Amino acid sequence: MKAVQYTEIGSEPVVVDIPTPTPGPGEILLKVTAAGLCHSDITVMDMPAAQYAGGLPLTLGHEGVGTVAELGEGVTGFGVGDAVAVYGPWGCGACHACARGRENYCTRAADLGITPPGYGSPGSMAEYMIVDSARHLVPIGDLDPVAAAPLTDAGLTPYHAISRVLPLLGPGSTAVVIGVGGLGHVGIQILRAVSAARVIAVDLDDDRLALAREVGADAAVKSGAGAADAIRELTGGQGATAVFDFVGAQSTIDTAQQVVAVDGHISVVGIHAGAHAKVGFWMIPFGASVVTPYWGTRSELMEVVALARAGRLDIHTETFTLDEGPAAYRRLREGSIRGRGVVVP
Amino acid sequence: MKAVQYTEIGSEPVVVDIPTPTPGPGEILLKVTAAGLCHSDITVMDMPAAQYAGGLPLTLGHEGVGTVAELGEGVTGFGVGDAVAVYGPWGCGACHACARGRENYCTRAADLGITPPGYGSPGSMAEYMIVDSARHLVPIGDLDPVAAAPLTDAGLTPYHAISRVLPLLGPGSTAVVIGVGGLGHVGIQILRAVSAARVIAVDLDDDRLALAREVGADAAVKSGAGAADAIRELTGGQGATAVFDFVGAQSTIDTAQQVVAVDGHISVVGIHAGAHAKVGFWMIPFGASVVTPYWGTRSELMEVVALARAGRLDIHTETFTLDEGPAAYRRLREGSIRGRGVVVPT
Amino acid sequence: MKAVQYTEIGSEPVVVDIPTPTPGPGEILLKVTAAGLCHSDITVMDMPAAQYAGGLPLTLGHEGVGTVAELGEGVTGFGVGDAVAVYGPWGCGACHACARGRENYCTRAADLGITPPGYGSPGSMAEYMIVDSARHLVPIGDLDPVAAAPLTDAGLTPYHAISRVLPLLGPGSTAVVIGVGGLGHVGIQILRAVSAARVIAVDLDDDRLALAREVGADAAVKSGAGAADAIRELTGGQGATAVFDFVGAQSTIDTAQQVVAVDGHISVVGIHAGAHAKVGFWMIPFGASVVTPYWGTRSELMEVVALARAGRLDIHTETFTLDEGPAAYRRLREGSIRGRGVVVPT
Amino acid sequence: MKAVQYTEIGSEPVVVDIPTPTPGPGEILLKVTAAGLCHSDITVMDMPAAQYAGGLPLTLGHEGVGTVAELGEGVTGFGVGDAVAVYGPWGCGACHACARGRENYCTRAADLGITPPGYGSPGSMAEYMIVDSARHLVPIGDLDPVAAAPLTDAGLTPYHAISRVLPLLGPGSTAVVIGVGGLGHVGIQILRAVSAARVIAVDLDDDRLALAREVGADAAVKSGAGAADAIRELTGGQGATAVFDFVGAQSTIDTAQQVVAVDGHISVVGIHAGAHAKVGFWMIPFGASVVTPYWGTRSELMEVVALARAGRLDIHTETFTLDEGPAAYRRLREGSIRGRGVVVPT
Ligand SMILES: NC(=O)c1ccc[n+]([C@@H]2O[C@H](COP(=O)([O-])OP(=O)(O)OC[C@H]3O[C@@H](n4cnc5c(N)ncnc54)[C@H](O)[C@@H]3O)[C@@H](O)[C@H]2O)c1
Ligand SMILES: NC(=O)c1ccc[n+]([C@@H]2O[C@H](COP(=O)([O-])OP(=O)(O)OC[C@H]3O[C@@H](n4cnc5c(N)ncnc54)[C@H](O)[C@@H]3O)[C@@H](O)[C@H]2O)c1
Ligand SMILES: NC(=O)c1ccc[n+]([C@@H]2O[C@H](COP(=O)([O-])OP(=O)(O)OC[C@H]3O[C@@H](n4cnc5c(N)ncnc54)[C@H](O)[C@@H]3O)[C@@H](O)[C@H]2O)c1
Ligand SMILES: NC(=O)c1ccc[n+]([C@@H]2O[C@H](COP(=O)([O-])OP(=O)(O)OC[C@H]3O[C@@H](n4cnc5c(N)ncnc54)[C@H](O)[C@@H]3O)[C@@H](O)[C@H]2O)c1
């Protein structure tokens, strides 16, 4: 089968021919219908050998949807042909976090050698993929696969970040979204669907600000040195109830600390090595909590799928073939994909 | 009347004679029965002129209990003689936070010039004190005033910090308390009363570790370079569900980050200028939230008083006269008050 | 001044001339800009002498907005001319519930003789009204008074009922709204604004089902014997996550129990004496909680006002003069007001 | 192997010899170390043929602990010899409730024919038992099996009921426990461990009131007509924040409604066919929610085990052999087991 793999440290991913896998006991083989590209893939591929934890070769793609092609021995609860999304942050299934579906916060995965598809286990950017267990599949019914694939991370990750502090986001609240890319453009829509927060979007790119307004942002303002003052002009001196930073550079985290309200929240979602919030007296308002969330929970993925099925998420995509996978990663690097890149085999 | 005041930048507080105040409309005059000393008072008195926001002179004391001596015009809901605790973080009373009793997070207090007793308004370390409004008084009934005064901050502040994340502290959880002083020794007891968390106390001083065990800590660890590893040996690799850092020095915050669990919490309660948690990828576990809480809410103070009335809080105190106030602050500076210093006016 | 009063048991309310009140200490006099009629007023006026708790005479109207006309002694947190909404369920201000703004659940109001405007204290259906304290006023800025008056109960009550279980109403949930009147037509809009629930409206009257669709209901079902089956056809067998019953008749409560999901909720908001949910094994699904909520909280009223100011609430009203007050109550009795009746004094 | 089975409608259970089962793919065979008797077993055995849903024959016992004896094909995460407790309310594992571990509220179990061990699937009152999947086993380490078996229901069910409203049970709250039997005597201890509620126990039997005080109840009062007034004398006129009714007879539910506080909770846990709370205006206080909870969640069972391992639960038991199983059910019927009956297979 055709797949897109990261095969040597510091090189671009390549299109390869590798054997179509067969599911072992408990596993499910999917025919992949759509595979999302994520900026985390760039970050992973830019790591030096010592830090890179994905293994070589690695079939990329931690955003996967497909149709059930073959059931491994003993698998129940799915039929051949069922359209499913892959829950990505695989955990042990048995610990206190996993028992609540919070496998993203599994305390045993490292020790048991459990890794996600697309970063340690083979991903979705291939004609077929293996899923380890039935509990990592969520039905999508007749959802369009191209717009569904990003739900598994571009949808799930913002959804989880927002869910952590949803009770803060009542009528009269303001949520700032920094970075209107794959994640951020979905985050805006989640905020509008599950809260009455006023949503202020921030991006470097005027076309991404237009995208933000297109998907329901109440205001959209230019990132950089003037952003904090511009946001405060919109909120008045109270600042923003919550800031969801999908960039996570030091400059954006600094903007977040400069605008967050007393008893508010900053969610540092974007990943930029070395960047950090400075949480101390006189450096942040009283009661303003800060967290780096990771991916999301099983029940959250179901809720994301439910939002999509209800028409609440307009996922902006561009479609690529498997052969175009490496070119698509170049596009993502240069910032020329308006929303999410999606590979269709 | 006699009072203890901070009167010039960089000097020790002094005992003074100033007029007994009269309550204006809406105000209440208390005869003070006990006034707590807090380490925040030291921090405030060590600020340079440019930063110090308390005004001069300032009657110290933001931990106050008393008896109602006189009602100002129009005051209802209290009688002369009623024993009350002073809710300290005064807010506007009208904004969304204040409407929920969360006057500690009032968004209008700065703009309206509203300051707390003992830091901008006259405090409790005097024979009498003024309280601005009835909503800032909570009844204590027959609670001993000496042990009640610290409930207003040494109790309220840890209680609020813990309350922010109480749902995390289920059976099987671990809570670390760093700094077993005024706040910390009460924090341990709150954790034991309102949660099933295992409590690990951390202090530099072996006698404070003994105090921690005396008030119900399950384990006690020496602070410093070995603390993080020692805590992890106790929690077995998952780390601590929550860390309540009542010191807030860089070293203690670093210990906190090195032990906190995935999807846990660090509450930076202690105040050390410049110190901060570094919240970023690879610097803290996934999902481990960090906050600097401030004081507490109206309903939280009521709950702290309810814990005291139910026998759940053994408040360790040492009593001083008003004349001993300055000496008591020297004791607090050198770290020789085992628990909370409390001034009792006579 | 002109006012509409209930003056004798079993009679219709009458238009009267009574003195314009002057505010005492702590009170505020409002020039009323709009006064809502509520079905609870009908229920109150239909009570026999032994049950009726409003006092006689009683100026009706527990839905009030106005402009500050005169400040009582000591009141300084509002200016003359400020547009304000009246928080209705007055409490003591001092108990644990009141400290959280939850004066609707005040434990001391009965004992202290504290009653709401429009049911024991003089209401808003008059040229002017007295408000007891500043904490019972919420600013509305430039909101149209006619559409603002219903926010104080038609908005607040559903808002509180929904807020009690808002975490249940995630994507994929269904909320049923029974009764698309004053409260129900606002409840539909609150659900759409603060949740991703699919909303199914239920009414006896086709025109009210049309109103429901006009304000954002996803589906509309005829009430009565076929309603439970019709709702289940829409929800596909799991039933409805939450049912907000703004009628509260036995038939509607029965429908609610027949459609509610496992681990769901029924809020019995409508008041029909004798009607009740039967919460027992084999009579309701496992985990499906039931409550009779009452009015709402201070912070909730602020949130309702914020929804209105953000354009999220299209309040359907019909305007009446004070002279038309009694006629308007006849209209409400016969069910011919499409949304909320609102009296505008001139 | 030896087992205790319900074999014909209206008869007592009997000791039988049936084949020792072999685990199929995904299943686990346990050597049973302890099997709890529950009053639900009596209720089930007293159902007429038309209602009884357990199937015949049925190996009784929905409270099970054991050691892993044999792993079915493909089973990972447990080793032979591991001591485990059986999570009882088996669900589909895939729905939104099950994904959160809340298999007690599974929406698909009925349709898929999934039933619990001891009521549709073979139970724990046998030398060996099958568990359907690894996710239905929780490790207990070196906990004594006799005291561990009741954790799976006598512990789990009260724990879940309490957990639904734990945020209500702050300092100053009161929780009433009605019925100090298997469930109730554990419920008292859970309340003391995870909350600061004052606990008032209620039972018909003076020896069970003594048991209540032995396990940490603050007061213990006689059930029946005088109970509501007696409880109110202890709480003052505010009533009880929460009432956990482990009897669920009409008389006990009525007591619960007569004592519950405004904005409180009644959990109807005990099962008595036909009995129900009457939730309507004038029949219950404003804001007092009522629910019939069912069993508990996966993560809750882990938390119950954690309480036991921390020494917070003193489980009162009496031990029986398999041959004594039928005699033990007679004892439970007559009310002569002080706590939980537990069968230990040899
Ligand atoms: N925490 C997690 O679990 C998790 C999961 C998935 C992705 N992520 C991370 O989220 C981030 C977003 O990923 P993506 O795939 O949406 O990226 P993307 O490449 O699709 O979009 C990036 C967007 O950020 C904007 N941007 C860049 N610098 C900016 C600045 N200084 N201010 C404002 N806007 C700026 C760009 O113009 C662009 O619109 C990445 O760092 C990714 O690694 C985190
Ligand atoms: N956030 C707030 O709202 C708030 C409110 C009140 C007090 N505070 C702050 O909380 C802190 C504690 O106040 P207090 O009155 O309880 O102080 P205290 O002087 O009574 O106690 C200090 C304790 O901390 C211990 N300690 C000092 N350095 C330590 C270290 N490196 N590691 C471990 N333990 C150490 C001491 O040995 C002592 O037991 C102060 O910084 C104070 O300003 C904050
Ligand atoms: N719990 C509280 O705190 C609180 C506060 C305010 C009002 N209420 C109560 O809420 C209820 C509604 O008040 P309102 O002012 O909105 O009433 P309304 O007269 O404006 O509306 C009544 C609506 O219910 C519909 N209706 C009547 N019988 C019905 C049935 N069997 N099935 C479905 N629909 C039916 C009508 O057709 C109409 O649309 C009243 O009982 C009122 O007393 C309760
Ligand atoms: N909701 C659920 O998921 C669930 C789960 C397990 C058990 N249960 C039910 O819980 C109830 C208790 O089960 P158990 O095994 O603990 O029972 P048990 O037989 O061990 O204990 C019964 C206790 O209730 C007392 N009692 C009886 N009538 C009383 C009254 N009128 N007032 C006060 N006390 C009274 C008895 O004196 C005895 O102490 C049963 O109805 C059972 O079916 C429900």
Ligand SMILES: [Zn+2]
């Ligand atoms: Zn990603």
Ligand SMILES: [Zn+2]
């Ligand atoms: Zn796990």
Ligand SMILES: [Zn+2]
């Ligand atoms: Zn202090």
Ligand SMILES: [Zn+2]
């Ligand atoms: Zn305020």
Ligand SMILES: [Zn+2]
């Ligand atoms: Zn009303």
Ligand SMILES: [Zn+2]
């Ligand atoms: Zn009150």
Ligand SMILES: [Zn+2]
């Ligand atoms: Zn049972």
Ligand SMILES: [Zn+2]
């Ligand atoms: Zn299920």
